[PDB]
Amino acid sequence: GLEAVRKRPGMYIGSTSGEGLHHLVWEIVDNSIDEALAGFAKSIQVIIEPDDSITVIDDGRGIPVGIQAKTGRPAVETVFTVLHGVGSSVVNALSTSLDVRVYKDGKVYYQEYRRGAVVDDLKVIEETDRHGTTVHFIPDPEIFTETTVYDFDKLATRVRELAFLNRGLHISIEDRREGQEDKKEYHYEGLEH
Numbered sequence: 345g346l347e348a349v350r351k352r353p354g355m356y357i358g359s360t361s362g363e364g365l366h367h368l369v370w371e372i373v374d375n376s377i378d379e380a381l382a383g384f385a386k387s388i389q390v391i392i393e394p395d396d397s398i399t400v401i402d403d404g405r406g407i408p409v410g411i412q413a414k415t416g417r418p419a420v421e422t423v424f425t426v427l428h429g430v431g432s433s434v435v436n437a438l439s440t441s442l443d444v445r446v447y448k449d450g451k452v453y454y455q456e457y458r459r460g461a462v463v464d465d466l467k468v469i470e471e472t473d474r475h476g477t478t479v480h481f482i483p484d485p486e487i488f489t490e491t492t493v494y495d496f497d498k499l500a501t502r503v504r505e506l507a508f509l510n511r512g513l514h515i516s517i518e519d520r521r522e523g524q525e526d527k528k529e530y531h532y533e534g535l536e537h
């Protein structure tokens with residue numbers, strides 16, 4: 345399965361240069377956009393963490409966590425571990441680590457993966473009053489051998505484009521890296537304008 349992705353990443357993300365590095369972000373963001381399209385997510389936050397890792401936070405319903413009959417595994421695990429708005433498992437495969445938190449039905453469901461492999465079964469780790477999905481990943485320098493450094497302006501440009509194409513969505517981009525902290529928030533108004 346995902347071993348194939350780690351060995352031929354060019355066939356899945358087009359490039360292992362800076363372009364591929366940024367493509368990982370869009371693969372995750374696209375899933376949050378799908379949940380805004382379904383009518384449930386209102387806001388998406390994209391964060392470049394101080395270590396060039398990425399966090400994407402949405403306030404949708406939360407990825408389904410129940411056991412699927414076909415797999416015997418929680419739906420959320422399958423999302424990240426089986427090759428398939430279908431790119432989550434590719435991002436997982438090409439990351440040193442990825443962690444997902446699903447906020448749903450008063451609970452926070454957590455799972456983590458290392459170079460695509462599951463660490464432990466999905467576990468409830470906290471109670472919560474919110475809903476949505478948070479995905480955090482560290483792109484693998486074994487794959488991204490040219491650069492693992494993110495371009496804030498490049499991300500911001502596309503985030504703004506996404507806000508426009510998805511009029512009504514709130515979407516932000518934040519840089520938390522040393523000496524260059526910045527945040528831009530975008531929102532195009534609907535009929536209330």
Ligand SMILES: N[C@H]1CCN(c2nc(Sc3cnc4nccnc4c3)nc3[nH]c4ccccc4c23)C1
Pocket residue numbers: 372373375376379400402404405406407408423429432477479
């Ligand atoms: N179909 C899968 C693909 C991803 N997924 C998600 N589903 C939902 S919410 C959802 C979607 N579909 C449903 N279908 C039936 C019942 N509940 C649902 C909740 N939110 C997500 N945020 C992400 C951020 C990154 C990657 C994936 C998601 C995501 C469900």
